[PDB]
Structure 1
Amino acid sequence: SAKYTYGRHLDFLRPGLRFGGSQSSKYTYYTVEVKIDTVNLPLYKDSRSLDPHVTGTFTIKNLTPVLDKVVTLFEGYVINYNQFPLCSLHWPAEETLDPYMAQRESDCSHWKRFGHFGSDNWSLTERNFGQYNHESAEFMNQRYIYLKWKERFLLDDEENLMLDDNHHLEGASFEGFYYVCLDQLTGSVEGYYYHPACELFQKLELVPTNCDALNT
């Protein structure tokens, strides 16, 4: 059928959901909190919409001795293998999506790093790297969901500035985006920050922290 069947949300990707965890660096792990603010997954397989599928807040705590909190607002897209395939170069050719572009080798390696794909049919030059078959379940019916998140604004301590790739804080820079993977069976999230000018594989780990509140 011409529609995606699910609001247009997931159990572990819905407005109001909070996650906690960390982002790694070579010296230590840093506390991270994420709040999902909006979720608007596509209704149509042949969608024309370019509106972000997810928005939220990302907070990193105790980053340097003199910087106790960095709060950003991010937007993002959920890979659906159709309008939004695994390879960014095959996303709609629209300037609003430029911040999510990477080399096809970068996308392929990062998605494969989460470790959930099969070993068959890999192809660097196919838009889903060979990993989406028409008998595959539609994206929301698979165990693992793939997303990219791009931070666009720096917020104040009460959740200020528009970010850009060439200006930064002492302790945090903003040139890249996150590859993200959500396990729909457990709610666990992993991610990797990526930009070619930055060291590879700063790793995000998150688990939902307010499921009890949402379920009561």
Structure 2
Amino acid sequence: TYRSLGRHLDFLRPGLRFGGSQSSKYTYYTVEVKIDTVNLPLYKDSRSLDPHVTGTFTIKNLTPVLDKVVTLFEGYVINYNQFPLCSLHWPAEETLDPYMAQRESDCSHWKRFGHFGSDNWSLTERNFGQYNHESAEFMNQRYIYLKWKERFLLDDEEQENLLEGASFEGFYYVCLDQLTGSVEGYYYHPACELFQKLELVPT
């Protein structure tokens, strides 16, 4: 009859702050991420289609004029089952369309974090060959993989609403280290074969 309330993780819980940078050859910005809600996909029911994470981005001094730019983001957690590493095997619900990418994109981006074994990689398998009979469940592995996408502009981090050009088209591949709290990310834009790099630690 009843459904699980889920769990919160030491480094994936409401109220948690991270700080760091987003950078690339021509970009460097100080950024802060705050986790607002968590609904980990521990099982498959209706709630597992709702966002698994919601939070805010804050960019410091985006323009010479704007000292604080704040966006609201939503995201989903890889659990290798209903939400495998290959986004194209995600459920067919339309609200997940903004998180899709080609198989090779997902594959290369997940690999680039550098925490997978060297063995058994296949572009045609729903977890790219990285989740097997002897793998631990996602919450019990050291590294957790997520996809984040911003979808609203806000005024302050207290969250009132005030994003549709090309500079908003992609999404973040995200990797959390549960042992140290460090967070790495790649902002991927479909139409450009370069990314931006997100690096955060807990505040």
Structure 1 Cα separation of the partners of residues 160 and 103 of structure 2: 23
Deviations 1:40-75 (A, max 9, x none): 112325777301110000111112323322211001
User: What is the rounded CA distance, in whole Å, between the counterparts of 1:175 and 1:168 in structure 2?
Assistant: 19
Deviations 1:129-177 (A, max 9, x none): 0000021000000000000001110111354xxxxx9999899921111
Check 1:152–1:171 CA distance in 2 against 1; reply closer, same or farther (3 A cut): closer
Residue 188 of structure 2: aligned partner: 194
Provide the secondary structure at the position in 2 that maps to 1:140.
helix
Is there any run of 5+ residues in structure 2 with no aligned partner, and where?
Answer: none
Paired residue secondary structure (2:124): coil
CA contact (8 A) 1:22 1:205 kept: yes
Deviation track 1:6-40 (CA, whole Å, cap 9, x = no partner) reads 95121100000000001003234200001000001
Cα distance, 1:192–1:151 mapped onto 2, change above 3 Å: same
CA RMSD of aligned residues (A): 3.7
Q: Describe how 1:103-182 pairs up with structure 2 within 5 A.
A: 103-157=102-156, 159=158, 173-182=167-176
Please state how far the C-alpha of 1:123 moved relative to its aligned partner: 0.2
Identity %: 97
The question of whether the paired residues in 2 share the 8 Å contact of 1:52 and 1:77 is answered with yes
Distance (whole Å) between structure 1 residues aligned to residue 112 and residue 71 of structure 2: 26
Whether the 8 Å CA contact 1:32–1:61 is kept in 2: the answer is yes
Deviates more, 1:150-159 or 1:95-104: 150-159
Relative to structure 1, is the Cα distance of residues 169 and 151 closer, same or farther in structure 2, using a 3 angstrom cutoff?
closer
- Which range moves more in the overlay, 148-157 or 23-32? 23-32
Alpha-carbon distance in 2 for matches of 1:166, 1:107: 33
1:109 to partner: Cα distance: 0.5
1:186, distance to aligned residue in structure 2 (A): 0.2
Given the two structures, how large is their TM-score scaled by the length of structure 1? 0.84
Query: 1:82, 1:124 → 2: CA distance?
Result: 17
Describe the shift of the 1:138–1:192 C-alpha distance in structure 2 as closer, same or farther (beyond 3 A).
Answer: same
SS at match of 2:194: coil
Cα distance between partner residues in 2 of 1:170 and 1:198: 17
Instruction: Tell me the CA shift for residue 185 of structure 1.
Output: 0.5
1:181 is displaced (CA, Å) by: 0.2
TM-score, normalised with respect to structure 2: 0.89
Is the contact made by 2:80 and 2:127 (CA closer than 8 Å) also made in structure 1? yes
Stretches of structure 1 that go unaligned for 5 or more consecutive residues are 160-164, 209-215
Contact 2:113–2:175 at 8 Å: present in 1 too?
Answer: yes
Aligned-partner SS, 1:64: coil
